[PDB]
Amino acid sequence: KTHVQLSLPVLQVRDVLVRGFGDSVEEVLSEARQHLKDGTCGLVEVEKGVLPQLEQPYVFIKRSDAAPHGHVMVELVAELEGIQYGRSGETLGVLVPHVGEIPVAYRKVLLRK
DSSP states (O other): OOEEEEEEEEOOGGGOSSOOSOSSHHHHHHHHHHHHHHTOEEEEOOOTTSGGGSOSSEEEEEEOOOOGGGOEEEEEEEEETTEEESOOSOEEEEEEEOSSOOOSEEEEEEEEO
16 A cells, blocks of 8 residues: 555653664665554654754654545655755654653554555
């Protein structure tokens, strides 16, 4: 399928144990997609002070369109040293590995896969 319905645990930035997906734009997009397929991906809502507490390159979920079955359609965009790889809409959050942190909420998304 071109899209997959996922419910992503929303994590507090200070709880995150693994603060990024790897060391290159291509690696972080690859690992993010793998963790999304395996159900081991969390989401941190971006506010003042959040990104400096995480590791670059960053992987964002961004709104791809204006929401089937309550699932916002999203795509992945990576960022390294202020340059983005991908073009999309508003940031829903930054993706991180999930390793059993307790979420504060869930974010229903339709991931372009």
